Write a protein that binds this ligand. Sequence first.
Ligand SMILES: Cc1cnc(N2CCN(CCCc3nc4c(Cl)cccc4c(=O)[nH]3)CC2)n1C
Length: 350
Amino acid sequence: KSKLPKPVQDLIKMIFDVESMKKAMVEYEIDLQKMPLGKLSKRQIQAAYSILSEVQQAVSQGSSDSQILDLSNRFYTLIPHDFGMKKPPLLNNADSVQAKAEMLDNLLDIEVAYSLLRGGSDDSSKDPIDVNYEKLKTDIKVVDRDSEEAEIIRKYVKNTHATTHNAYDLEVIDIFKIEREGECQRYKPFKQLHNRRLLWHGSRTTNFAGILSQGLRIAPPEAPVTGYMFGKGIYFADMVSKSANYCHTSQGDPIGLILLGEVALGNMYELKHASHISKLPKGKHSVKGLGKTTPDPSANISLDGVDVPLGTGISSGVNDTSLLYNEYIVYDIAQVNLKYLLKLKFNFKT
Ligand SMILES: Cc1cnc(N2CCN(CCCc3nc4c(Cl)cccc4c(=O)[nH]3)CC2)n1C
């Protein structure tokens, strides 16, 4: 029997659940009879990204539906979908490419989680929770509810839920302080950079074994750059509800996970609309997608020398922008230092 605290044991069970991995793949319309969990590989995912890039080029060249058919079919040959003896839907537009790129990003984290479960040793005398915990190479500790850091974190959740995201309310169940092995050392060239901020990152429950073991990663070179609003980087929000939407929780699964990370933004490149960039302009360290609403800047507080934008939402003064709320993007994995992990209960009003 494990000596780990009960909330840590529940987190490990949740993140390594095989049935949840299968459920995420069904949601993606993947044919599990043709492509089961165990048959998924890095090689196949990479080849699928490369076919999406071929679809992206054909779309930008203004190719007809008859011309795109062979390229669309190629993607389905690599990643089999659930359609029986029917023709699959045509991937003839930008929205299609973006939906499929997002699915492949998720498959990469699911493949990592399954590879950890299969690639080790079997010993019945050890508690499986302890065995799976060690595979994460992350120190996980419970933050005391009555502590100062828990008070600041609860305030950030309470103040940054947008009015436009009123389909649900959030309840903080557990707060974990996290320390990925070697991340602190990796972050050292950016530890004293200006504009360091504590920001949110929401993701499906099935991605968290991949995130804790490998950290937050950028889409690979094979991936189509137009399938990402501001190119291939790591995306964050200053509004808890903007990131919580990306947990993809529902009435049938109302528990989700969210990260709080220290991001070294430095000199920000401020944008109002889509820009599928390969590299940042000289002297820039990040992208700031300018939102119509921003947390109140006079309510900005400091937690261990890092700025926490926990103010209530007010007008930014920015006109004619495609974003309702801010977003922040970094293009170097070393610019992120993961600090906390929150387990949230979603109370749906719909
Ligand atoms: C190689 C690799 C491994 N796993 C990945 N994926 C997995 C999927 N994950 C989705 C992130 C979702 C998200 N999007 C946001 C946007 Cl678009 C704006 C503002 C905030 C957010 C936010 O909090 N979460 C991306 C990384 N990749 C690319």
